[PDB]
Design a binder for this molecule. Structure first.
Ligand SMILES: N[C@@H](CCC(=O)O)C(=O)O
Ligand SMILES: N[C@@H](CCC(=O)O)C(=O)O
Ligand SMILES: N[C@@H](CCC(=O)O)C(=O)O
Ligand SMILES: N[C@@H](CCC(=O)O)C(=O)O
Ligand SMILES: N[C@@H](CCC(=O)O)C(=O)O
Ligand SMILES: N[C@@H](CCC(=O)O)C(=O)O
Ligand SMILES: N[C@@H](CCC(=O)O)C(=O)O
Ligand SMILES: N[C@@H](CCC(=O)O)C(=O)O
Ligand SMILES: [N+]
Ligand SMILES: [N+]
Lengths: 421, 421, 421, 421
């Protein structure tokens, strides 16, 4: 029986449950418990009424799903977008259960959304919306229950309002009720670069397993936003060189090496990578064929496909963006012997630092930049190592290994606790 | 914007929503606020895992909806049925908002359900399902927040289980967390005949508005279940003659009067109304056109239609069943000038006594049967008179007016309380 | 298996335990649940340190027991006596469960004790002892959890201290946390005469059942404290003739009848019955054999015995005292055809007015003396009626029947509720 | 002047209380406060009903005792054994107050027990038993109140179930509600070897004070389970010579020494020590009389007894077990000038790691094995240092000095906080 409240096509949720299906062969004694993964623990649909600037009331659909809770409080961001749907928010929570268990955070999986176009609202209106939403899901929330975070179209500003609103309602300041707060509000050092640095940490852990030296290595990187330039800087700081960067404006190439800091100025200065004087322009499609040690897809989804996977000369692909390589491209890349570090752990840097933020918030005692990076390495190098060991011991690719690890840990937590009530 | 999570399906929810649309022209300055009735305040969808008797785990869908909370805690029964759906549970909670506001109960509108065939579960499995569902909806529940009740395929037994579960969870005995409990557990006297008694009380109020004498009046009753037979008993006991009852098995007719206590012994033993010694059989289609003062449909829906409305010679129709008369049949009865006491207030006796149960539960001081009946009478005549009054002011029929009374009160609570947060 | 922490012997507990055993044959399908009655739900032993007037600290043993809580919160007094023991507090809690169920109060049974001789403490030390105890048992207290009352060597003064200690500790006025409070603090009117009035109400109900007229009737009364002189006032004010009163002095007798107010005036002067101008003296032994309609023992335990029970000529014995008759006396009175209204319900007026205090405390609305006495008649006539019905049903004496009604109500609440967790 | 609810012989508790007496002469100005240690603050006795696999209900005695709670929340294992009595749970809670204080953990003393033979139950019955128990003692539990742990016949499995029952009852993730959990649920690393390592760390501190060389020092060890083999391993890794080992199968002596890792996989194959190819057999009472520097009794209680203490020719006895020396055996070992590091600090490795578990659980941030170990040394060296100095300052044996430090720290806490309420 699929879930009756989704109707004939279950959409994004079906895609999630199919992946649980595919992981079932590798679960051993835990396999029967896998059924619990195909239904969310808790779905909460709330109305969120908002007095608009004219003084009239608008009504919005807000959601908060706790996909699974066996391993700890629900954790997962909150998205404002006109195309938000029950189905998607459930699926996304399902992915957070997987991601958080694969990287070894002490959390279950949760997500939230409000179906609204935030570009149609004033800053005032957005504030009132965040506040009402926070109040409405208040029965879910707590640093030991469910810790929202930023997602599509939300950030530090919204997170301050959730915090502030839960803290006023509840009668005390509780910084850890959300993460991705500003520093001033109990936020954490090292958030901005977390993800791009974690791509490097995980890429470099793979390189040691295959005896690839980092100091010599060449790097090509797609996307130069927060993740891309952070990855760029880390590779460049460890002795590697960035020989090409592609983004939405154009592509630039220089086998001798591009300076990430130098390029970045130009990126805000003009708008994109195009016209960087210390490199030559390159056609969109050739980027993928460059002889490199490291390729970092850190931009849009569906960028390494059946159409170009044969062109890839990289020894290691480290996934910065969510889902940059298609299932077809995986098969091709496995064939060509290229190591793919899956988005699941490769991009987990941000979620790890927000875990760090939750942690510092309990006794309001904040860590230095350097303790953040050191502890970020410990978490992600341990996640790469556990995913590597499973990939070897079961003869599956790293991506399949990541989902086996995740499911295995959630299902072990559940087997231990037992069924109660 | 209709609710996106329903999909282009309205179903039972769209029927509720259209009734709201139909009331808007009578709402005056409260009208803009009617939009709020077209979205439940909250929906909670839960997974209810249950260890079956065969050692395996089954997963059921549970729902608890709070449609509107403005006049009070959400109040409404819980249904166990394999056809239970999100949209159904929403719509029924919407009708609860409306029923409570028209009967004048200090409650909001709630509803719950499990998608399960209880026929297929043993008593043990049923217990374990009930406990886990009540644990799962724990966060909603409490005498001041949400009070479930029996509905389709649940009764005393399930209510005992819900009370004890929540009580054990919270380490206090909290009798008022559900209603329809057994007396031994803080139930209320008078509950069984309540709805039936209430059909009469409503028909009597109606009678007094048109100068119709109850002593010596003739009644015909379709349905001889808990509602039907208690309504007959009430009528008899206030001096009316029951002359015809139509059943499953047929119709019996006798102008001298049928003793309902005698007839009941027959329906209990023999199996149904057919073959009752002290009356003659009657052909089903002849029931509707009989010369009588009161007609009480207390059986299935859509029993009074275009096909038979013109034959009805009753001065008062009192709706014991939900939806026994079609809108077309309404228009006909209006044209003939027969008063229709609408199901919304007419069959509210059971709901009114559950409320008395919750009242009594707050200090565990229990009322006598007579006291229950007298306070029941107060509630139901207050409800009739309020509807009558709106019916006369706006020149609309009783049915419309009951819906107008409900909406006006809910929006009135909301207008005074205001928008917060 | 017997309770290990009591060891071999009992002793008050094994006595209660045996009464449970004797009731089992009459329990029907509830019989296998009766084992639960032979174990306290909860036993709390506290140390109560108290600063003495001389500046030193002393350490007293404190106890609170919840024998059974299937029917409602624990209810029972706190006793201060140097011979208080764990075993005794347990058995007394057992007797509270039975008592509350037999009279039909919505309460489980509890008891408390402190092992202290209160004659040797100053009022200042007794306040400090009371305040510390209530604190130590506070995890247990609350109007919906556990409601203490006065008992041996406690009264209004220390109930006022318990209420205050709990209230201050919890930050709210919670009058309903204990009963037996001063009326200035949310006590109930009608407390002084409750037990005596109850002895009458219950006697008169028995009289009805045997066609015995109260107006004609002669009454002998042992004891003339609160229970005895209120019983006497009640009997006289309903047209009965009080012909004999025995006190700690001696006995007075008058066939024409004694005015109990005039007697009471004479006792408040002379300190007891004796030389009462309007009655002749009688030797103590002639008292029990007086030809009367009603005999009321309202003094100490064990006053009706193998020694004097065979001499009784009364048609009705109505037990005002706690256990005034021995089991061997019950056997004798049974053969002689004398009706014994058992103490469990006969003396319950006090405990019922405490119930009323608690009920009134929920919303701080207090009833008139007229209302308390009407409501008290209702409780005790109902209690007597239920005991009567089981006595006839099962062909057993009233005493035994009271124990059966009690154990049935407890066990039925337990069966309905189920076993959880 | 003993507690009334234990009778004239209080067995275990009397022994604890007698031990408090003998400590009073060393307490200085805190000596009058010592009476407080002769009472348990709180004794809770629950009934724990379980549904058996055969459908019938069994009732078990459950206990939780808080001996003292001045220094912090209560801390102590829960034991399932058919010999568990109120007296014993009390004693063990008392020893826990001493132990926790002696090592400098921020905990008061507690202990639980169920009186049951767990070998008579199926794993399902053992679960339902565990969950009922944790429910019944619910009112006591919380990371800031009472934090249970494993003891006789309990382990990781029961703890998981306690964490789960409690977390579900309360609707929050609360890992720190018990310790000794699986790592997957918030357990700590380094729990397997903690006691073993502690025995060594604590034996070394004793050496570094009596001018004893660890290195070439010969070590005899009774018991080769978790405690024994980790002790041998750390003695070995620190240059020492494991010359003898005795578990249940026999004893294996070897002048030249035994490499424990080699001995381990031998016991992890043939069942015990008995058949070890790389040593000669010279058992059994011979083992005790061996000329050694370190004797580690790490098996059962009462092993070094008033009947075999004579043979002992070791310089330092380091107690890995609980109570491996009778008091008469202490006198003889004092006589021969042999150092006995008392079990109260010598085996406190496990309890320190439990403390670390609880610490890590507050923000769910988990320490490396290297960190656990450095932190465990820091704690156990400080404990010894404090115990040593008092043994010297007051010229008393190491065991008595630990008890004195323990009594002093508790009473100082009690004196600083003062008496209240
Ligand atoms: N006792 C929990 C297991 C943990 C979980 O699933 O979150 C349950 O039955 O659901
Ligand atoms: N939007 C991402 C990241 C949030 C974060 O920075 O913690 C999520 O839901 O997990
Ligand atoms: N099924 C009805 C029952 C009302 C009641 O008996 O309390 C409801 O849900 O409103
Ligand atoms: N403050 C409430 C009032 C209406 C209600 O309680 O439903 C709101 O804006 O939602
Ligand atoms: N000592 C009485 C209570 C006194 C009262 O409530 O009036 C009892 O425990 O039953
Ligand atoms: N659920 C309760 C029912 C009986 C009671 O409340 O005492 C139990 O298992 O013990
Ligand atoms: N069984 C020991 C140690 C438990 C632990 O490892 O923390 C106790 O109850 O104190
Ligand atoms: N105020 C506490 C201090 C000792 C403790 O906390 O146990 C008391 O009177 O007992
Ligand atoms: N993902
Ligand atoms: N009323």
């Amino acid at each position: 029986e699929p879930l009756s409240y989704l109707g004939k096509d279950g959409g994004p949720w079906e895609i999630f449950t199919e992946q649980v299906d595919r992981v079932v062969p590798y679960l051993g004694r835990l396999a029967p418990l896998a059924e619990s993964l195909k239904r969310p623990k808790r779905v909460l649909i709330v109305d969120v009424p908002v007095r608009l600037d004219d003084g009239s009331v608008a009504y919005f659909e807000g959601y908060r799903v706790h996909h699974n809770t066996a391993r700890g409080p629900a954790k997962g961001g909150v998205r404002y977008h006109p195309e938000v749907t029950l189905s998607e928010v459930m699926a996304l929570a399902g992915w957070m259960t997987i991601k958080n268990a694969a990287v070894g955070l002490p959390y279950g999986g949760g997500k939230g959304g409000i179906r609204v176009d935030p570009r149609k609202l004033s800053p005032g209106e957005l504030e009132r919306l965040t506040r009402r939403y926070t109040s409405e899901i208040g029965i879910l929330l707590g640093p030991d229950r469910d810790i929202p975070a930023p997602d599509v179209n939300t950030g530090e500003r919204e997170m301050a309002w959730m915090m502030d609103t839960y803290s006023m309602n509840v009668g005390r300041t509780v910084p850890g009720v959300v993460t991705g707060k500003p520093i001033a509000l109990g936020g954490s050092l090292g958030r901005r670069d977390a993800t791009g640095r974690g791509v490097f940490i995980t890429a470099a852990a793979a390189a040691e397993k295959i005896g690839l030296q980092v100091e010599g290595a060449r790097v090509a990187i797609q996307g130069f936003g927060n993740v891309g330039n952070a990855a760029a800087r880390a590779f460049h700081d460890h002795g590697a060189r960035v020989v090409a960067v592609q983004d939405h404006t154009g592509t630039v190439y220089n086998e001798a090496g591009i300076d990430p800091y130098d390029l970045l100025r130009h990126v805000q200065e003009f708008g994109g990578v195009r016209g960087y004087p210390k490199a030559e322009p390159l056609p969109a499609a050739d980027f993928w064929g460059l002889p490199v040690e490291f390729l970092v897809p850190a931009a849009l989804e569906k960028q390494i496909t059946e159409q170009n996977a044969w062109r890839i000369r990289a020894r290691i692909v480290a996934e910065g963006a969510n889902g940059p390589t298609t299932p077809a491209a995986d098969d091709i890349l496995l064939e060509k012997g290229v190591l793919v570090v899956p988005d699941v752990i490769a991009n987990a840097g941000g979620v790890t630092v927000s875990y760090f933020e939750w942690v510092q918030d309990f006794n309001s005692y904040f860590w230095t930049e350097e303790e953040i990076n050191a502890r970020l390495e410990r978490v992600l190098r341990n996640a790469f190592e556990a995913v590597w060991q499973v990939a070897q011991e079961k003869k599956i690719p790293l991506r399949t290994a990541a989902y086996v690890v995740a499911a295995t840990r959630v299902l072990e937590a559940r087997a231990l606790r037992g069924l109660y009530p």
